[PDB]
Design a protein around this ligand. Structure first.
Ligand SMILES: CCCCCCCCCCCCCCCCCC(=O)OC[C@H](COP(=O)([O-])OCC(O)COP(=O)([O-])OC[C@@H](COC(=O)CCCCCCCCCCCCCCCCC)OC(=O)CCCCCCCCCCCCCCCCC)OC(=O)CCCCCCCCCCCCCCCCC
Ligand SMILES: CCCCCCCCCCCCCCCCCC(=O)OC[C@H](COP(=O)([O-])OCC[N+](C)(C)C)OC(=O)CCCCCCCCCCCCCCCCC
Ligand SMILES: CCCCCCCCCCCCO[C@@H]1O[C@H](CO)[C@@H](O[C@H]2O[C@H](CO)[C@@H](O)[C@H](O)[C@H]2O)[C@H](O)[C@H]1O
Ligand SMILES: CCCCCCCCCCCCO[C@@H]1O[C@H](CO)[C@@H](O[C@H]2O[C@H](CO)[C@@H](O)[C@H](O)[C@H]2O)[C@H](O)[C@H]1O
Ligand SMILES: CCCCCCCCCCCCO[C@@H]1O[C@H](CO)[C@@H](O[C@H]2O[C@H](CO)[C@@H](O)[C@H](O)[C@H]2O)[C@H](O)[C@H]1O
Ligand SMILES: CCCCCCCCCCCCO[C@@H]1O[C@H](CO)[C@@H](O[C@H]2O[C@H](CO)[C@@H](O)[C@H](O)[C@H]2O)[C@H](O)[C@H]1O
Ligand SMILES: CCCCCCCCCCCCO[C@@H]1O[C@H](CO)[C@@H](O[C@H]2O[C@H](CO)[C@@H](O)[C@H](O)[C@H]2O)[C@H](O)[C@H]1O
Ligand SMILES: CCCCCCCCCCCCO[C@@H]1O[C@H](CO)[C@@H](O[C@H]2O[C@H](CO)[C@@H](O)[C@H](O)[C@H]2O)[C@H](O)[C@H]1O
Ligand SMILES: CCCCCCCCCCCCO[C@@H]1O[C@H](CO)[C@@H](O[C@H]2O[C@H](CO)[C@@H](O)[C@H](O)[C@H]2O)[C@H](O)[C@H]1O
Ligand SMILES: CCCCCCCCCCCCO[C@@H]1O[C@H](CO)[C@@H](O[C@H]2O[C@H](CO)[C@@H](O)[C@H](O)[C@H]2O)[C@H](O)[C@H]1O
Lengths: 37, 558, 73, 87, 188, 494, 75, 80
């Protein structure tokens, strides 16, 4: 009944996106430091 | 007196259609509720577990009259929000006794004070709160199953009408519709519970059910399993109406959708009356002998709701970005603390319950008052943020996002610090009053063997403190996206105020800018008194806690 | 805040200091990181604690002279 | 046994409803009828006229919620134009 | 004590917990937004109910199995069952760190609840005088010396009168050497 | 009124005057900063008056006031030799903490002064209160001002730093609250005189220990729980860093003399090997990772973890020497850590805007006054003799060896590892080659402000090192009251 | 350890774990009265089963830990 | 502390906090009369809390005497 802007999960995903937390893999981040060359 | 006030206000409201008369109907409602306080104040001259009145369908207790006074005062504080204009104009030249009482000020007050705002144009708004208050003070005083059902509906039906009263709001109509529909299913559970009580006992009186339960508690063809089953269904209805998890999903949606003036009342009064009625029922349904009747105690649902309310209220609140959804979830985790002290039926827990309830009703009032005042203060401010132009019902809820409070410390420091003091009280930080409330509910549970629940409460108190701190980070850690309106201070834009003596003779004429507009004293003083109570409680605690020690001593006495 | 003096900020050292600060955001649970973590956090404290318990109150030196034994227990 | 069957029916009305908000109004009333019918049949079994009185007041409150509910539904329809849930 | 049929109890645990998850799977079918039909409870949501039976059955079976081996009934068994129950929850997700992590969280909480006492039901009542019990605790200021030496023991600076003669006896028994400290005075 | 309540009202009166002076003049920020500084000096003069009158061998709490009116929660103030020097340390630091950060604030200066003036009252109270719930009340009332001090006047990673300190300190302190509530339930009050008479059952003691130690382990802090400090101290303003290390880290040290030594003795005795195992580990790991830290201000913060562990093992020795050494090492840490924070956070960061040790080299060549004081504060961090830091470490380490020898033997390795990082940091900033090439323009040397607070802090560290009897004569009789044990021929006299 | 597992098995792993969990539970709230009504019935039945089947209280805690960890997993 | 003083200052503190929220000037001369008024209201609420405390003390004292007669009458009847 309410707008998606107010109760929708979609705008949670903009305030708290999953991209806020890195998930680099062994190929991307073997030194486990951020991909620092 | 509440019934004399409703009928008198109703007759006056019935013969008028003027929307300018709303201001004065809310003022007379405050005066009417003050007479109710003076009548109930005289009804405290006896020591009694209870006296049955009007054929045994009602009762009076020291706790009933104490909390009739509390309900009337909380209503008076909320009623001010519609009894006085949000902003005022003040000049040092009109500030003395001679000026305020004998002189007069003339100026165009319409756009400055918001004379014709939506809240100042509902004639029956003061009337419908009185109807809700009436059902609240009846629930507290009900001694019969029928009176319980009739009182709970009187309160519920008026709360639905409050949520739908802003008829031009497509958010308020939805919220009231959600509330009536999920509230009606709750009413069936309360009605099923009382019906199943009468069919197995032949009685509608609480005292007969108390004596039937009393005799059954001894460590054959009629084993009384019905009382703990009936009260269990009966508890689901009231758990919904206080929004205890898992029956909680409605409150964040309804509290977010209706106007902020309305949610102050809707989110406070209902929990005051429901929690008082449950306390007396928990006491006289207790088991003094551990038997098979005690294994099916209805009070277990309150212990599971409390555990679930502590977790849901603090965990789901982490990712909320809308302030009224956040405060809705904060209330859920606070009733998990209230429900834990109710479920432990001990002298200490009952005293902790009376304090947690009163202090939290007062503190959650300050949070709503500060929010309403912050929205009425951005009148002299402009924003270019894109996320604010897309908001809905910006007059019913001026502050909807926690992003809108970014940099309020710069705009208003003590208003920001008042909200800081209130928020830290919700966390439980000493020396603030909210700490002493949680302290008493942790010590009661620990002394009675609810150690596992106490550990869960302090863990969620850390989790719930995360989203409380996020609001503080917004107000103080960042600069404001709100900037002063450029036109209100252009050096050529002034409004003429005239000073007039008693016989309308011009004493003086003053030139005023937007800097001479401030918050109305009714909202500034109310915020000031409660913030001080939260801050200075450790110097003024004797008579507040002594009242609760005496009320519980009468209830447990003999 | 206050203006500081001019420093030739090395882009290479600045990005290195940034790397050290955000490094935790990229820690994973591997067979190696678990092995180092288990050794340091469990094994060494448990070994130190075990010796602490076994030798606790075992010896006293005060006023002990020849013909007496250091061992209390 | 009839009173319990009808209470299930009102409950199953909520179980089987994703779109009708009208049918939730109807299912609340079926539940009220079952509970009043139970009180009424147990009243005849115990020779108690007070059950008949409690049934009467449940009918009055039931109609009053119907009025309050259909009025709120009218307020909602005026601004929305549909009583349908977008599921 | 009376041995418990672990297999018989294990089925009860799987059915009770797996029954509730079957009720949870049913909500998923009812709330599904497409025409999935009635048999979607056992095809699309079957894994949800299946893991509930797996988790519940492993907990009660391992709790019962733990009790038989240790020949005792206490809060410890609620730890073994919780560890194996949490391990089963981690097996579904297929991630090693969580197999161990979920077992840790489940085992700690299910043992902490039991060792504290059952909060979710009616707490045990001692059925005694609370005023006498509390007052005894507040006024039990001194205790027999034997009472304290039982928990801490002599040594570590707790040298009760007679410690040296006892230590001589203790040292003689274990070291086989008589203690005889030297004089330090050439005269007498 | 009493003289211990004058200690609390003066910082409150200063808050009022800063708030009302603008209403009598648009007033300068220099006028706000003189009010706050004169207010802190008056508290220091009162505290020196209290110390002149104080009886060094009295077993009754002194400068108390006859309440005679009892409520649910009531403030009871008193002083004993165990607490007098903690009060004095708070009243000597707060004036320097203000002077150190005199130019560095710039914005929100009234708010900054009000928080420090409020912190001084709350930290003074926590030493003066004669109840254990009142101790908790002030031991945790400092968390809201410190959340906002870091957020308003902190460095770049301030938001996360302030969330860490508040949430860890809130979580850790809520296990202390459960233990305190249990003792109050069993005894009926938390007033010290009544609680210290009471003896708990061993099992109650062993569970009250689990909950006071969990709180203290988070607030010491121990090695695996020290993340909040590595963030809080570094991102905090200079003044907040001085308070948090010198005064707040000492609240747990003084809380063992109240919450554990006198009321849970059997639990403290039978669990010391767990404490010593943790204390030993946090001596080694903290020191190994202080060697490889590249942020100077975070190298001073890590050093604090290693020192707190020496004084924590000292409080758990059941010895008169390790208990007084623990208080001496906490007083010594208060002066030296203050100076090293002033050097890193208040002189280098002021001139460079950087904390990375990569950019600093040969600073003695252009700043010879800074390098002289910096050397003396590095030697005290290393526990060199002639500084109070050596006396505290020696007595703290001896009682550790006398209690459980093996752990004091590992803990004694702090003599090699504190020296290692202290000289290595020194040789890399003051020495280590010629003035760096990353410095485009020359840096001025110490100001008359920077010189005189560094000189004042060094003066306390050295003079108290020569004659520690200035502090030792006050603690002797009062320390004598927290020892648990008997001797076979000295006890049970007839 | 300090920048690794102590922050993963600690504040940073509790942060990223709980934020994921709270988004999933918050996605159960779709503001549909039909779906909210179903939830009330569900939460009603679970209370009825618990206080009539005399189930061991531990069976409940397993349910809560199962439920909480199911919202810990995405998709 | 003294209740009359605490409440008198409480009213003084409420006036101070009010003007701080409204961001109005503390200490305008033609509006100084509010400080005696706010404090005077504070003093009055305090004489009332003094009457409340006096009566609460009497009744809490009675109750402690009642719990002691009950525990004693019960103890006496258990001597048989
Ligand atoms: C625990 C509890 C402990 C309590 C201890 C004491 C606490 C501190 C004392 C509080 C006193 C508040 C009342 C006095 C007050 O407002 O004086 C300032 C006020 C003028 O100062 P101002 O704020 O600069 O005025 C701005 C303009 O007047 C323009 O102002 P405005 O138009 O925005 O509104 C003016 C006025 C509107 O209301 C009235 O006219 C007040 C009517 C009160 C009697 C009915 O507002 C108020 O008075 C709000 C008071 C809220 C009280 C309830 C809070 C909860 O005084 C008046 O002119 C009010 C009438 C004089 C007092 C008569 C009644 C005295 C007893 C009242 C008992 C209630
Ligand atoms: C932070 C909280 C903010 C709350 C805002 C309100 C502040 C006060 C908080 C509640 C305090 C308790 C109020 C109870 C009602 C007031 C009673 C009182 O103070 O005096 C009793 C007196 C009663 O006096 P009386 O006239 O009935 O009889 C007097 C009897 N002798 C002679 C012995 C004194 O005041 C009243 O008249 C009661 C009516 C109060 C009107 C509405 C008050 C609302 C507040
Ligand atoms: C011990 C139990 C109690 C502790 C439990 C811990 C729960 C912590 C929940 C933290 C919720 C907020 O956590 C944080 O919020 C801020 C809000 O901008 C965001 O923080 C983020 O900021 C920027 C964007 O501005 C991101 O690029 C960055 O990756 C991150 O730091 C993230 O959304 C989230 O990392
Ligand atoms: C912080 C907010 C301000 C403080 C809040 C509390 C102030 C008011 C507390 C009042 C309750 C306790 O104070 C007292 O309690 C008893 C309880 O029956 C009542 O006392 C009443 O009955 C008794 C017994 O017949 C009479 O002796 C007494 O004259 C009468 O007033 C009154 O209520 C009050 O005299
Ligand atoms: C300063 C920090 C360190 C101080 C604490 C460490 C002190 C270490 C003391 C070690 C010796 C203790 O006391 C010592 O114990 C050993 C056994 O281990 C025993 O040694 C004995 O061994 C043989 C039997 O094998 C005996 O026949 C012989 O008489 C004696 O040498 C004696 O009891 C004593 O010589
Ligand atoms: C991590 C979480 C760890 C578990 C939480 C702490 C549990 C503490 O709970 C502990 O339980 C034991 C069980 O009787 C009790 O401990 C004590 O209880 C009473 C004393 O009143 C004694 O008769 C009993 O012999 C003794 O064991 C206390 O209730 C408490 O000391
Ligand atoms: C329990 C809650 C937590 C308590 C923690 C302690 C918080 C202490 C905060 C101090 C009080 C607020 O501090 C307040 O800051 C605001 C900043 O907008 C100042 O207000 C002023 O600041 C500067 C002064 O030049 C102006 O540019 C600005 O326009 C104006 O608003 C107030 O004069 C000051 O008093
Ligand atoms: C690693 C940390 C592990 C522990 C962390 C959490 C513990 C924090 C402090 C818990 C204190 C122990 O728990 C406390 O113990 C005492 C006795 O010992 C209990 O006292 C007792 O109360 C009831 C009532 O008589 C008794 O029936 C019961 O035997 C016991 O619970 C307290 O009710 C309990 O609150
Ligand atoms: C024993 C286990 C641990 C005990 C409890 C300790 C829990 C501590 C958890 C704190 C988690 C961090 O808390 C969260 O941090 C992020 C930073 O990444 C903040 O996010 C903030 O900083 C980022 C940094 O880029 C900026 O974009 C911006 O200022 C804001 O988004 C959140 O506002 C805060 O809520
Ligand atoms: C000396 C140690 C002291 C520790 C004191 C107590 C610290 C807090 C204990 C629990 C800490 C949380 O622990 C952490 O939880 C979350 C669960 O979502 C997990 O966090 C992570 O899980 C997996 C990694 O396995 C990731 O893919 C996922 O992105 C992330 O959520 C971590 O696997 C776990 O390390």
């Amino acid at each position: 009944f309410l707008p998606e802007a107010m109760v929708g999960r979609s705008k949670i995903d903009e305030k708290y996106p999953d991209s806020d937390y890195p998930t680099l893999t062994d190929k991307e981040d073997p030194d486990m430091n951020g991909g620092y060359i | 007196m509440i019934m004399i006030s409703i009928l008198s206000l109703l007759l006056s409201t019935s013969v008028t259609l003027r929307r300018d008369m709303s201001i004065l109907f809310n003022r007379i409602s405050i005066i009417a509720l003050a007479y109710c306080i003076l009548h109930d104040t005289m009804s405290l001259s006896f020591i009694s577990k209870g006296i049955g009145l009007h054929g045994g369908l009602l009762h009076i207790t020291n706790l009933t009259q104490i909390f009739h006074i509390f309900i009337f005062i909380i209503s008076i504080l909320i009623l001010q929000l519609t009894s006085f204009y949000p902003r005022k104009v003040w000049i040092p030249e009109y500030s003395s006794l001679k000026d305020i009482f004998f002189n007069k000020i003339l100026y165009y007050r319409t756009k400055i004070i918001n004379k014709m705002g939506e809240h100042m144009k509902i004639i029956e708004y003061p009337l419908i709160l009185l109807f809700v208050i009436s059902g609240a003070v009846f629930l507290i005083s009900t001694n019969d199953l029928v009176s319980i059902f009739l009182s709970i509906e009187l309160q519920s039906y008026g709360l639905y009408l409050l949520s739908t009263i802003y008829r031009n709001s497509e958010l308020s109509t939805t919220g009231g519709l959600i509330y009536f529909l999920l509230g009606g299913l709750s009413s069936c559970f309360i009605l099923l519970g009382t019906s199943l009580l009468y069919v197995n006992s032949g009685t509608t009186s609480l005292d007969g059910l108390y004596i039937l339960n009393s005799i059954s508690d001894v460590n054959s063809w009629y084993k009384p399993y019905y009382l703990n089953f009936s009260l269990l269904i009966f508890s689901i209805g009231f758990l919904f109406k206080v929004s205890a998890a898992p029956f909680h999903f409605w409150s964040p949606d309804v509290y977010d959708a209706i106007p902020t003036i309305v949610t102050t009342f809707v989110a406070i009064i209902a929990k005051i009356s429901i929690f008082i009625f449950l306390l007396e029922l928990v006491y006289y349904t207790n088991s003094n002998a551990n038997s098979y009747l005690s294994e099916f105690s209805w009070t277990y649902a309150l212990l599971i709701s409390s555990l679930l309310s502590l977790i849901i209220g603090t965990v789901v609140g982490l990712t909320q970005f809308r302030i009224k959804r956040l405060l809705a979830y904060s209330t859920i985790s606070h009733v998990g603390f209230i429900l834990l002290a109710l479920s432990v039926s001990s002298i200490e827990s009952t005293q902790a319950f009376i304090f947690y309830l009163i202090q939290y009703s007062i503190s959650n009032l300050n949070a709503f008052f500060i929010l309403i005042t912050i929205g009425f203060s951005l009148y002299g401010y402009v924003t270019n943020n894109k996320e604010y132009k897309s908001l809905l019902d910006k007059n019913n809820s001026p502050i909807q996002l926690i992003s809108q409070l970014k940099g309020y410390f710069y705009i208003n420091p003590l208003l920001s610090l008042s909200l800081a003091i209130t928020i830290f009280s919700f966390v439980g930080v000493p020396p603030l009053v909210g700490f002493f409330a949680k302290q008493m509910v942790l010590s009661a549970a620990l002394d009675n063997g609810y150690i596992f629940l106490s550990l869960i409460a302090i863990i969620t108190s850390v989790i719930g403190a995360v989203y409380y701190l996020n609001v503080i980070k917004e107000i103080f850690f960042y600069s404001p996206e709100h900037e002063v309106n450029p036109v209100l201070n252009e050096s050529d834009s002034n409004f003429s105020l005239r000073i007039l003596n008693e016989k309308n003779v011009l004493i003086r004429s003053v030139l005023l800018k937007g800097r001479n507009i401030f918050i109305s004293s009714p909202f500034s003083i109310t915020i000031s008194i409660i913030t001080n109570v939260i801050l200075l409680f450790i110097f003024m605690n004797k008579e507040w806690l002594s009242m609760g020690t005496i009320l519980v001593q009468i209830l447990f006495s003999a | 805040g206050l203006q500081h003096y001019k420093i030739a900020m090395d882009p290479a050292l600045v990005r290195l200091g940034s790397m050290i600060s955000n490094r935790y955001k990229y820690f994973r649970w591997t067979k190696r990181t678990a092995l180092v973590s288990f050794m340091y956090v469990v094994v060494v404290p448990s070994t130190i604690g075990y010796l602490a318990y076994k030798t606790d109150g075992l010896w006293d030196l005060r006023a002990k002279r020849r013909g007496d034994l250091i061992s209390e227990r | 046994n009839i009173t319990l069957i009808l209470f299930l029916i009102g409950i199953l009305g909520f179980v089987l409803n994703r779109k009708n908000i009208i049918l939730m109004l109807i299912s609340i009333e079926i539940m009220l009828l079952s509970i009043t019918f139970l009180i009424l049949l147990s009243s005849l079994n115990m020779d108690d006229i007070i059950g008949q009185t409690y049934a009467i007041y449940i009918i009055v409150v039931a109609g009053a919620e119907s009025a309050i509910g259909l009025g709120i539904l009218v307020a909602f329809y005026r601004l929305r134009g549909s009583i349908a849930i977008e599921y | 004590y009376h041995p418990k049929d672990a297999v018989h109890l294990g089925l009860k645990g799987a059915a009770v917990v797996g029954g509730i998850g079957l009720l949870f799977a049913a909500v998923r079918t009812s709330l599904a937004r497409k025409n999935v039909g009635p048999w979607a409870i056992f095809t699309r949501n079957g894994k949800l109910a299946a893991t509930f039976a797996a988790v519940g059955g492993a907990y009660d079976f391992t709790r019962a199995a733990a009790a038989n081996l240790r020949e005792k009934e206490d809060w410890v068994n609620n730890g073994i069952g919780g560890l194996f129950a949490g391990a089963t929850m981690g097996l579904t997700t297929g991630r090693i760190p969580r197999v161990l992590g979920f077992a840790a969280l489940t085992g700690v909480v299910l043992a902490t609840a039991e060792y504290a006492g059952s909060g979710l039901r009616g707490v045990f009542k001692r059925d005694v005088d609370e005023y006498e019990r509390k007052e005894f605790l507040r006024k039990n200021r001194r205790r027999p010396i034997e009472e304290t030496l039982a928990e801490i023991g002599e040594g570590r600076g707790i040298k009760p009168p007679g410690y040296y003669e006892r230590r001589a006896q203790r040292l003689k028994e274990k070291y086989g050497v008589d203690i005889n400290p030297v004089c330090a005075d050439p005269d007498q | 009124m009493s003289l211990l309540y004058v200690l609390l009202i003066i910082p409150i009166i200063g808050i009022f005057l800063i708030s009302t002076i603008d209403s009598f003049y648009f007033f300068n920020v220099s006028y706000y900063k003189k009010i706050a500084l004169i207010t802190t000096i008056l508290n220091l003069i009162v505290s020196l008056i209290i110390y002149i009158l104080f009886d060094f061998s009295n077993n009754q709490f002194q400068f108390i006031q006859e309440n005679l009116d009892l409520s649910f929660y009531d403030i009871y103030l008193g002083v004993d030799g165990v607490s007098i020097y903690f009060v004095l340390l708070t009243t000597i630091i707060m004036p320097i903490a203000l002077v150190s950060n005199w130019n560095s604030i710039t914005n929100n200066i009234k708010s900054y002064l009000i928080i420090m003036l409020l912190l001084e009252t709350l930290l003074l109270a926590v030493f003066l209160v004669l109840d254990v719930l009142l101790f908790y009340i002030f031991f945790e009332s400092i968390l809201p001002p410190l959340f906002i001090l870091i957020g308003l006047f902190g460095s770049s990673n301030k938001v996360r730093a302030s969330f860490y300190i508040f949430l860890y300190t809130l979580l850790g302190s809520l296990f202390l609250l459960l233990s305190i509530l249990t003792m109050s339930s069993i005894v009926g009050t938390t007033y010290f005189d009544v609680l210290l008479k009471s003896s708990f059952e061993y099992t109650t003691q062993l569970f009250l220990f689990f909950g006071i130690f969990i709180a203290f382990a988070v607030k010491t802090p121990v090695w695996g729980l020290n993340s909040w400090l590595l963030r809080a101290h570094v991102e905090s303003p200079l003044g907040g860093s001085i308070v948090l290390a010198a005064i707040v880290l000492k609240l747990s040290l003084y809380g063992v003399f109240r919450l554990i030594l006198p009321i849970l003795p059997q639990a403290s005795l039978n669990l010391t090997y767990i404490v010593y195992a943790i204390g030993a580990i946090t001596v080694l790991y903290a020191s190994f990772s202080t060697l490889r830290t590249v942020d100077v201000k975070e190298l001073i913060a890590y050093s604090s973890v290693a020192h707190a562990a020496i004084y924590l093992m000292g409080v758990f020795s059941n010895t008169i020497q390790g208990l007084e050494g623990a208080i001496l090492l906490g007083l010594a840490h208060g002066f030296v850590s203050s100076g090293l924070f002033i050097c890193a956070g208040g002189i280098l960061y002021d001139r460079t805007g950087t904390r990375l040790i990569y950019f600093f080299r040969g600073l003695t060549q252009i700043m010879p006054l800074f390098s002289l004081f910096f050397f003396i504060l590095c030697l005290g961090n290393a526990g060199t003799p002639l500084t109070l830091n050596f006396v505290g470490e020696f007595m703290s380490l001896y009682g550790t060896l006398e209690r459980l020898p093996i752990a004091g033997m590992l803990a004694s390795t702090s003599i090699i590892f504190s020296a290692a990082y202290s000289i290595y940091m020194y040789n890399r900033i003051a020495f280590g080659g010629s003035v760096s090439l990353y410095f485009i323009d020359c840096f001025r040397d110490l100001t008359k402000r920077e010189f005189f607070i560094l000189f004042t802090l060094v003066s306390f560290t050295v003079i108290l090192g020569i004659y520690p009897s200035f502090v030792l004569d006050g603690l002797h009789y009062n320390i004598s009251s927290v020892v648990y044990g008997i001797e076979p021929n000295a006890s049970y006299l007839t | 350890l300090d920048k690794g597992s102590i922050e993963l098995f600690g504040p940073y792993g509790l942060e990223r774990g709980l934020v994921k969990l709270s988004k999933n539970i918050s996605s159960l709230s779709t503001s549909h009265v039909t779906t909210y009504a179903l939830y009330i019935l569900v939460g009603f039945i679970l209370y009825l089963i618990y206080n009539n089947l005399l189930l061991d209280y531990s069976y409940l805690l397993l349910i809560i830990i199962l439920l909480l960890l199911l919202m810990m997993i995405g998709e | 502390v003294n209740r009359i003083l605490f409440w008198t200052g409480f009213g003084l503190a409420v006036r101070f906090w009010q003007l701080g929220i409204e961001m109005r000037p503390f200490f305008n001369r033609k509006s100084l009369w509010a400080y005696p008024l706010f404090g005077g209201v504070g003093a009055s609420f305090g004489y009332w809390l003094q009457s409340i405390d006096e009566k609460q003390t009497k009744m809490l004292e009675e109750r402690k005497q009642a719990i002691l007669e009950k525990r004693a009458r019960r103890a006496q009847r258990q001597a048989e």
